Design a protein around this ligand. Structure first.
Ligand SMILES: Nc1ncnc2c1ncn2[C@@H]1O[C@H](COP(=O)(O)OP(=O)(O)OP(=O)(O)O)[C@@H](O)[C@H]1O
Ligand SMILES: Nc1ncnc2c1ncn2[C@@H]1O[C@H](COP(=O)(O)OP(=O)(O)O)[C@@H](O)[C@H]1O
Ligand SMILES: Nc1ncnc2c1ncn2[C@@H]1O[C@H](COP(=O)(O)OP(=O)(O)O)[C@@H](O)[C@H]1O
Lengths: 287, 959, 671
């Protein structure tokens, strides 16, 4: 108990900087294992009959240790949720236009959290911040808000992934990048490799507004019979489904044309190498 | 043809050969009805473009199942040769899909079960997915992957499903069983027409199941799926048919004769050849050989054209492709066997190698200036340049080359000379990043993110790749060869497996990807593949550097070339070195004194496993001191320098002395006597006259005379307070010779290890010379089981300072002019890893050989300035003494400090007794009997009651 | 020996069908007339003479030691109602264990029918199924309702939880829990130890198999459409019963035990239904010729029954059976199910149109069933009986200080095992010879194995004497030797799956002996004796490599290539028969179920006929089709048929047909 009464007098929060130039709590193993050891020790000495030198010195600090444990094991969850959603909401674009209410609620939550971070940074003492009223209640409020908004984000991801079910083959981060970088259509082409069998790029227009066709790893191109305009279908899932459907239709049309052409070669015993090679060159290997 | 049109052609020949065989079988069977099964069993196509809906215009019917064509663009892909086994596989899978079941092809891996399923899925146009169930399996992703398969209409293939461990296997089997039981309802006898689609539950919610999807479970099965999966035995593929069709599609005339020869050859390669961990004689390897043969044939025909014309020998082209792929992976023993097999399968034809005379003339110039040995054939060095050229070929083809071979081969020299030769020939610079794994943590190799700030910091390899990619600094015009010298291990190649393959991209844990630029070559200079995953070895080509490639003559030539040109004192030193090299030149030839002595020493018994380079390095190191004893002798006597006549007689005897103390410096005294006796009967150097005294008991002096060591042992009298005190060694026969060897091997600043029984006097003999030298300050370090490179780093930070980049970061001791020696107490004690590499040993090796290491704080190369290492070991046979690796062993010579003999013990303690009895003058006459009793009783207790009865019966001079 | 010199009736008794009812008196005993002494003496004699009757004589011994009513209770059908009414505590759950391919829920169902007690039958395997079963258990313990779970073995964790929960007492005595589950080694042992175990097996026999299959097939699915569907279903039942009854005779039948449960029969029935619907669209009586014979044969030979066939020869046999049965001739009146049965009898088709006639014929099948029903030789029963007897002997031997006995047997092994093997011949002119290379590698690896075995056995001898201390490797080696199981470190060549260490050291000594002879021959001559060695193929570590080396030597001796050669065999009688330039003499080959006069095979009831000095000749093949009077016999290495060495072509006699040889399971065995 002699060391317990002095360990809390000198205890720093070990603030660390963030990529957004904000302070955060870094030490967690010390903030948990040492506190658990102290609370176990005080419980043991209160239980042990050898306590007639400390008749009342740990009960006034057992509640303090409980408060420390509760505050910090809610704070760690609040911090991890806040940093994860900060990365999600700042890294990817269009998160302001898509889910705007979520964006504004997270902005308000981040404002409150950064105000609390500044408050705890101005006095980087655990005792000096436990004395601050309303920290615990605000912390449960923040934890509930982060949980609710993260659940809403997951539900939105599931809702967008159900449409155009090809998105089920990619992870949450990749899907977030795909749905966020709607303007930066040149970043989508690193994910088509896994969402299709062979299709690796989409041949856009000159201004990257109309999808003219697709490609493959080798470089084989399949010109769309009917181009799809992203400007008339701003949502990414809509024009992706349109690309898939137009690709199916184009494959069917080119198969019909190729079989019509090859009927002539098949029926005739005499085959000219020039026309046969041109027919091979014109049509895709699959067809 | 263009490559895309070439692939289109090859697919067309494949399918047309299939159709030709089908039509020939139909004609031979005299088939006339269109509903006969022998025609209804073939995959038939029906196209009707009149139907409005895109999906069912094309219909495919195997036997009775009527699938549609899912119009999904497959790209180009690869088409499998339709063998009878593939036909049966297609039939069985189609029948299983008709009954709403799944396909479970089983058989040995390499048959093509997964590829057959993928080819069938591509035939119908379905988006078939393959999941690797051996490792790198993301069970968390399957929860959404299965929903995607259900809601898209995509297939699924699980390669080697049984390889999954039971915990993951049960959950995946449960999900697959749910899918199959939900899909079986689509063919209900009373609910065939499903107005509401049948739904299952995978994500704890109901999801619609499209009838188009499928799931295949390949093996090498759980009772959940036994009733819902058909099985097929894909045991052996028809390799002859596959080869014949690929040969015919590559333009090879008389394809069947080549195929029914190459297939038996690849069968013999698995029997007459010694089994190796890297030999690949499977179907996949056969295909790579056939396409290489096609490329070679096209190159030959287009070269003959520029000088249709179909008269080239096809067999001589098929054996050139084989010899350009199998020979680099062959050990020295299998090489004469491969050509013997070729002389049987392909009698009369022979393999002719490309001369590559453009590079074999820059090799001769990169060599002969690095004092190396060059050859051109059966002459010395031919095998080495051959291996260098093969390594160049592998660099040209692949990018993840892995040079392999036993310690002592010229692996490092080969790739260095190749880099310099390429730099000279092509005018393109070459920079090598020798990253050593198993010395830094995997986190320090790649990096990590702290779970609190999520800040990403890069490791060594990640930082190197980022510098190469982001910063140009002659990116495409500098050859970045990231040599991964060390030992191969799955742990640090899990991340690299994404880089070795064709992806050429690294997936960092933060999610960022870095694409390998085409100039970067990731090479793993390793010793053996005992602890390498099959994926890592299979994702990259290799060349085997057998120990027969580097001959002894080449090592001797390298030494004598370095001696005559490199000055030991960093002008008269060069002259005396050249004279000495001329003197020992007759002995440093093929056969002769040194070679015969080495051959005889290889059949003796030594405390540690005998390595040629270890003995050769020690011999060269002591000979480098033999040319310095000349320098000091001339410096001390400015007039009357030691002329050629005295030099000859000095060095002829010094060579024998060094041979004796290098080839038997790690064996018992009986073995030393045996080596001396063998030398006496095969040498022409005047030896000690007395035959009863071993040559080991003599010194060469400086006048070229055999002066016995007993003439250099003084009789000392210690003070009474200094009797048996710590750090007090009485001169004897062993402390006059082992001390001399220690001084000789420390004058070269060569790391070394003293190996001997516990208590013999390794530490005493070492500290008797370390602190005697004015500038050899000693730092004490103890190596136990738990020791890691962090101990060495802490010692360096405690005693050494990092110079602020004089020319790069340099680690130097705090004080100037003093050499630190980190005495390694029990260097072989550190615990054996589960993958056969002691991390601290590989860490100290990095700086014993490459002269430095890599900082973990800024990924910067730091070079040791004045740091020396010394070692000590108990014999490896003792428990807890893990034998050292050959890669580090060859760099450190060892000295066997055996237990002092009876008489030697007498001369050591008798002196202590006399100084101790000065407190009792009445008993000076009893000093000798007291010692004679003590030593005799100690010997009696040593002879019996040894370690065999109990593990604590250690009797040493310490007692 | 002197006793059996006389008593000419000894041979007749040796040839008796059941030589256990009367056994000649051979033991030299004067006074002992106790029944048990005579029983055990006759049992030892039966283990000596005719070991196939070992089970019969064991049954007679148990009868003489416990009365002739002891095992008779096991024959009667078990009445579970008496067991579960009195001596089954409702705490103890009845385990309804069944061999895979069988279901026992019908037994508890008929028990409920006779006991007029409701059953809360629950299927196991669904996620909600566990919750529903738990709720039923909770609501049934308070009311004594008989809860019966089906295939509960699927979930081991839930079964463990149920076993732990069952320790709580049940209010109602009428409760009777039934956990129907198959014989799966993943079931928790606690449940088995804490519950009553009932084992159920399918009754052996073709007739029982057809009863089971016909009861499995619904009546509606077998009656509609053309009535030829009924005979097709009957043929399917015969084929399925045959291919399951042949599984019992695993070595002589199908090389490996394939899993042919109800799924294959369901797939075959679905295939037949679909293809008869397609071929016969209406309901007219389709002619037998229009039956899609080729479709059904191909589908059931490469898709639903050939999909589990691992090697070529089993596929050939499956094709042989399907060709014999599924043909338009099967709808005639004189078509035989299987000839040669009981010597010369036959089995006819029931000339039926409805399932009732086929079922009545099936139940009319005679009780006696020789292996000739399956096409196998009549002595396959003797082989199986001998195997079961030796298995019983091993099972009881495992049902039985030892320092001295182990030391004595180790010393006896050391004395019996030959000394070290020498490989001191390597000539540069002999490197080219492929036979020299193969013999060099064989001798080298065999000598290394011999040295390792010698060192380990000497260490075992020394540690038995007490002058040495055993280590973990030595400890596990002793644990393996005490139980007579082959050490894993001593296995470097293919051996039968499970074989005694004494047999291993004996055949290892034989192999070392032939290797010493090979080394002596290679020391005497370099390239002349190696061809003239009458090597024993069984003793080779990799005999397929020996065949490859012989082919290489023949190709290199002439100018021919390796792929231009085909094997030709000529069995001789005299051991001193001269070898040709390409002829290679081998010994130890054994022919199963057949014999040869000069070079023409002929069927014989006595299996394992020794082939003296089989000559392997390599000749330049003409790429011509083989005739119909020759067969391709597999050449296995062990008595168990698991590994293929090569294939041998033999001329059959002028009467027998290749199909009979294929369906009798004939082969050539090295050991
Ligand atoms: N012509 C030569 N070719 C190759 N090595 C030579 C030649 N002449 C001398 N040598 C010596 O051969 C040795 C080659 O060892 P190398 O540097 O290739 O080893 P490593 O691959 O780094 O390590 P390890 O030997 O443990 O596998 C060196 O001691 C080198 O000086
Ligand atoms: N019929 C075939 N024609 C051509 N190549 C084939 C054929 N069957 C298999 N292969 C090849 O065999 C190799 C091994 O296939 P893989 O799917 O890895 O086998 P497995 O599933 O047995 O492990 C691949 O290179 C594949 O293309
Ligand atoms: N000349 C000598 N030769 C050998 N041992 C000696 C000699 N002089 C002293 N000793 C004794 O040898 C022992 C060596 O102990 P230590 O240095 O721990 O041996 P090691 O390094 O072999 O474990 C000490 O007891 C030391 O006093």
């Amino acid at each position: 108990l002699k060391q317990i009464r002095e360990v809390w007098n000198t205890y720093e929060l070990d603030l660390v900087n963030y990529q957004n130039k904000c302070r955060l709590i870094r030490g967690w193993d010390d903030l948990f294992n040492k506190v658990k050891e102290h609370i176990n020790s005080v419980s043991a000495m209160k239980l042990s009959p050898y306590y007639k030198v400390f008749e009342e010195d740990a009960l006034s600090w057992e509640d303090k240790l409980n408060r420390i444990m509760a505050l910090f094991d809610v704070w760690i969850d609040v911090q991890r949720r806040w940093v994860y959603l900060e990365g999600i909401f700042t890294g990817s674009a269009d998160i302001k236009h898509l889910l705007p209410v979520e964006t504004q609620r997270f902005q308000s939550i981040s404002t409150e959290f950064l105000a609390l971070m500044k408050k705890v940074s101005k006095s980087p003492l655990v005792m000096d911040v436990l004395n601050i009223q309303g920290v615990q209640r605000s912390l449960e409020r923040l934890a509930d808000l982060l949980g609710k908004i993260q659940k809403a984000l997951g539900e939105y991801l599931e809702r967008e992934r159900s449409s155009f079910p090809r998105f089920y083959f990619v992870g949450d981060e990749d899907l977030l990048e795909i749905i966020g970088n709607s303007k930066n259509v040149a970043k989508l082409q690193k994910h088509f490799k896994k969402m299709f069998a062979g299709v690796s790029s989409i041949i856009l227009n000159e201004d990257n507004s109309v999808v003219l066709g697709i490609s493959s790893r080798e470089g084989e191109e399949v010109m769309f019979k009917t181009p799809v305009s992203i400007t008339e279908h701003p949502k990414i899932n809509e024009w992706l489904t349109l690309v898939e459907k137009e690709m199916r239709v184009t494959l069917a049309k080119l198969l019909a044309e190729s079989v019509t052409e090859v009927e002539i070669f098949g029926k005739a015993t005499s085959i000219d190498p020039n026309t046969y090679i041109t027919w091979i060159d014109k049509y895709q290997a699959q067809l | 043809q263009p490559p895309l049109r070439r692939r289109k052609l090859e697919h067309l020949i494949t399918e047309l050969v299939h159709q030709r065989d089908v039509t020939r079988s139909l004609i031979k069977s005299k088939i006339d009805n269109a509903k006969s099964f022998e025609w209804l069993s073939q995959m038939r196509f029906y196209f009707d473009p009149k139907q409005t809906d895109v999906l069912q215009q094309l219909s495919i019917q195997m036997a009775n199942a009527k699938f549609n064509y899912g119009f999904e663009y497959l790209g180009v892909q690869d088409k499998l040769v339709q063998t009878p086994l593939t036909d049966r596989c297609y039939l069985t899978m189609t029948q299983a899909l008709e009954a709403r079941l799944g396909g479970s092809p089983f058989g040995p891996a390499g048959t093509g079960k997964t590829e057959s399923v993928k080819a069938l899925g591509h035939q119908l146009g379905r988006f078939v997915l393959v999941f690797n169930c051996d490792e790198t399996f993301d069970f968390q992703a399957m929860g959404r992957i299965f929903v995607g398969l259900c809601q898209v209409g995509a297939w699924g293939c699980f390669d080697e499903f049984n390889r999954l461990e039971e915990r993951m296997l049960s959950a995946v089997s449960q999900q697959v069983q749910c899918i199959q039981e939900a899909l079986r309802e689509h063919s209900n006898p009373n609910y065939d027409k499903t107005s509401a689609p049948i739904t299952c539950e995978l994500l704890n919610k109901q999801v619609k199941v499209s009838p188009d999807m499928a799931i295949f479970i390949t093996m090498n099965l759980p009772d959940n799926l036994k009733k819902l999966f058909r099985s097929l035995a894909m045991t052996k593929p028809d390799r002859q048919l596959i080869a014949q069709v690929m040969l015919y599609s590559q333009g090879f005339r008389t394809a069947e004769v080549l195929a029914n020869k190459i297939v038996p050859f690849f069968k013999l390669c698995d029997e007459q050849l010694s089994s190796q961990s890297h030999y690949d004689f499977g179907l996949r390897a056969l295909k790579s050989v056939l396409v290489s043969a096609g490329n070679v044939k096209r190159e030959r025909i287009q070269k003959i054209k520029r000088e249709i014309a179909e008269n080239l020998p096809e067999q001589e082209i098929l054996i050139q492709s084989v010899c350009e792929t199998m020979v680099p992976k062959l050990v020295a023993e299998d090489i004469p066997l491969l050509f013997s097999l070729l002389s049987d399968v392909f009698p009369g034809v022979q393999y002719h190698r490309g001369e590559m005379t453009a590079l074999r003339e820059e090799l001769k110039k990169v060599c002969q200036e690095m004092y190396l040995t060059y050859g051109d054939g059966e002459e010395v060095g031919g095998m080495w340049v051959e291996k260098v050229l093969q390594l160049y070929q592998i660099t040209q083809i692949n990018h993840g080359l892995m040079m392999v071979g036993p310690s002592g081969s010229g692996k490092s020299m080969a790739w260095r000379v190749l880099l310099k030769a390429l730099e000279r020939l092509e005018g393109v610079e070459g920079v090598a990043h020798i990253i050593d794994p198993k010395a830094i943590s995997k986190d320090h190799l790649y990096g990590t993110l702290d779970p609190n700030t999520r800040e990403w910091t890069d490791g060594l390899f990640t930082h190197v790749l980022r510098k190469i990619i982001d910063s140009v600094r002659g990116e495409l015009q500098k050859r970045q060869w990231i040599v991964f010298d060390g030992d191969v291990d799955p742990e640090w190649v899990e991340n690299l497996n994404s880089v070795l393959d064709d992806n050429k991209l690294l997936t960092l844990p933060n999610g960022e990807r870095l694409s390998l630029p085409p100039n970067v070559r990731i090479m793993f200079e390793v010793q053996d593949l005992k602890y390498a995953t099959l994926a890592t070895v299979s994702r990259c080509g290799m060349v085997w550097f057998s120990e027969d490639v580097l001959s002894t003559d080449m090592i001797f030539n390298n030494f004598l070339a370095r001696l005559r040109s490199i000055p030991l004192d960093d002008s008269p030193m060069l002259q005396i070195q050249r004279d000495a090299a001329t003197i020992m030149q007759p002995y440093f030839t093929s056969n002769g004194l040194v070679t015969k002595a080495l051959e005889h020493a290889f059949q003796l018994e030594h405390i540690m496993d005998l390595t040629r380079l270890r003995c050769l390095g020690s011999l060269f190191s002591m000979l480098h001191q033999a040319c310095r004893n000349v320098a000091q002798y001339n410096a001390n006597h400015p007039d009357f320098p030691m002329q050629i006549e005295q030099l000859e007689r000095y060095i002829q005897r010094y060579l024998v002395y060094a041979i004796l103390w290098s080839l038997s410096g790690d064996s018992r005294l009986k073995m030393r006597a045996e080596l001396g006796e063998y030398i006496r009967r095969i040498t022409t150097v005047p030896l000690p006259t007395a035959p009863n005294i071993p040559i080991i008991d003599y010194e060469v002096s400086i006048s070229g005379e055999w002066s016995p060591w007993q003439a250099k042992v003084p009789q000392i009298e210690v003070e009474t307070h200094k009797v048996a005190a710590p750090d007090v060694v009485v001169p004897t026969l062993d402390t006059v010779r082992h001390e001399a060897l220690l001084y000789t091997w420390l004058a070269e600043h060569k790391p070394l290890v003293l190996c001997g029984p516990p208590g013999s006097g390794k530490t005493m003999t070492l500290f008797s010379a370390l602190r005697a030298l004015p500038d050899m300050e000693v730092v004490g370090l103890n190596f136990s089981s738990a020791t890691t490179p962090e101990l060495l780093l802490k010692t360096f930070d405690h005693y050494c300072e990092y110079r602020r980049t004089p020319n790069g970061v340099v680690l130097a001791p705090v004080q100037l002019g003093k050499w630190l020696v980190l005495f390694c107490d029990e260097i072989n004690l550190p615990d054996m890893d589960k993958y056969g590499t002691q991390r601290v040993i590989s860490f100290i090796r990095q700086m014993v050989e490459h002269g430095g290491f890599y900082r973990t704080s800024d990924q910067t190369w730091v070079k040791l300035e004045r740091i020396q290492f010394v070692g000590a070991c108990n014999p490896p046979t003792d428990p807890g003494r893990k034998p050292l690796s050959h890669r580090f062993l060859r760099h450190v010579p060892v000295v066997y400090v055996d237990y002092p003999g009876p008489a030697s013990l007498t001369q050591i303690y008798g002196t202590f007794n006399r100084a101790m009895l000065r407190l009792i003058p009445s008993l000076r006459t009893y000093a000798e009997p007291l010692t004679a009793a003590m030593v005799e009783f100690y010997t009696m207790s040593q002879e019996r009651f040894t370690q065999d009865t109990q593990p604590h019966y250690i009797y040493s001079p310490r007692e | 020996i002197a006793k059996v010199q006389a008593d000419e009736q000894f041979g007749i008794w040796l040839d008796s069908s059941s030589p256990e009812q009367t056994v000649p008196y051979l033991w030299s005993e004067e006074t002992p007339a106790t029944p048990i002494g005579q029983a055990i003496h006759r049992l030892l004699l039966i283990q000596a003479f005719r070991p196939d009757r070992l089970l019969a004589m064991a049954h007679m011994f148990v009868s003489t030691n416990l009365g002739e009513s002891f095992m008779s209770i096991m024959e009667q059908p078990l009445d579970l109602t008496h067991i579960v009414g009195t001596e089954v505590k409702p705490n103890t759950p009845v385990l309804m264990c069944s061999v895979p391919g069988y279901d026992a829920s019908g037994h508890v169902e008929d028990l409920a029918a006779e006991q007029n007690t409701q059953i809360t039958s629950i299927a196991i395997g669904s996620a909600e199924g566990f919750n529903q079963a738990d709720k039923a258990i909770n609501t049934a313990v308070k009311s004594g309702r008989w809860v019966m779970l089906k295939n509960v073995h699927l979930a081991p964790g839930w079964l463990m939880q149920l076993e732990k929960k069952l320790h709580s007492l049940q209010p109602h005595a009428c409760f009777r829990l039934f956990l129907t589950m198959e014989i799966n080694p993943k079931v928790p042992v606690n449940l088995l130890r804490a519950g009553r175990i009932f084992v159920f097996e399918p009754p052996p026999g073709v007739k029982a198999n057809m009863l089971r299959t016909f009861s499995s097939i619904p009546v509606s699915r077998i009656c509609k459409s053309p009535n030829e569907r009924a005979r097709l279903y009957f043929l399917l039942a015969w084929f399925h019963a045959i291919i399951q009854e042949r599984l019992r005779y695993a070595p002589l039948g199908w090389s490996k035990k394939y899993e042919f449960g109800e799924s294959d029969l369901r797939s075959a029935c679905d295939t037949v239904d679909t293809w008869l619907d397609d071929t016969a669209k209406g309901r007219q009586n389709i002619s037998p010729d229009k039956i899609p014979w080729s479709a059904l044969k191909t589908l059931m030979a490469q898709s639903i029954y050939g999909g589990r066939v691992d090697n070529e020869f089993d596929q050939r046999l499956l094709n042989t059976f399907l060709e014999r049965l599924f043909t338009t001739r099967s709808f005639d009146s004189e078509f035989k199910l299987a000839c040669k049965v009981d010597g010369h009898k036959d089995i006819q088709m029931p000339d039926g149109i409805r399932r009732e006639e086929f079922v009545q014929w099936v139940e009319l099948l005679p009780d006696t069933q020789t292996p000739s029903w399956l096409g196998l030789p009549n002595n396959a029963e003797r082989v199986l009986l001998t195997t079961q007897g030796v298995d019983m002997i091993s099972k009881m031997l495992k049902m039985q200080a030892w320092m001295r006995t182990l030391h004595t047997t180790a010393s006896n092994w050391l004395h019996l095992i030959p000394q070290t093997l020498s490989h001191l011949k390597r000539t540069v002119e002999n490197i080219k010879d492929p036979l020299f290379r193969f013999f060099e590698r064989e001798v080298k690896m065999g000598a290394k194995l011999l040295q390792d075995v010698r060192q380990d056995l000497a260490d075992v001898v020394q540690v038995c004497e007490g002058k040495k201390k055993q280590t973990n490797y030595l400890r596990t080696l002793i644990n393996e030797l005490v139980k007579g199981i082959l050490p894993r470190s001593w296995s470097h060549y293919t051996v039968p799956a499970g074989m005694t260490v004494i047999q291993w050291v004996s055949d290892f000594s034989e192999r070392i002996k032939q290797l010493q002879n090979i080394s002596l021959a290679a020391a005497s001559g370099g390239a002349k004796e190696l061809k003239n060695i009458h090597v024993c193929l069984g003793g080779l570590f990799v005999p397929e490599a020996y065949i490859t080396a012989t082919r290489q030597y023949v190709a290199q001796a002439n100018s021919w290539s390796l792929e231009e050669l085909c094997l030709e065999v000529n069995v001789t009688t005299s051991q001193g028969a001269t070898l040709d330039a390409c002829s290679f003499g081998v010994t130890g080959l054994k022919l199963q179920g057949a014999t040869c006069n000069n070079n023409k095979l002929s069927l014989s009831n006595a299996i394992s006929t020794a082939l003296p000095l089989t000559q392997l000749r390599w000749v330049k093949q003409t790429n011509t089709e083989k005739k119909a009077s020759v067969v391709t016999l597999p050449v296995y290495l062990n008595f168990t048929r698991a590994d293929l060495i090569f294939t041998v072509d033999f001329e059959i006699a002028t009467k027998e047909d290749p199909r009979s040889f294929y369906e009798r399971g004939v082969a050539v065995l090295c050991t």
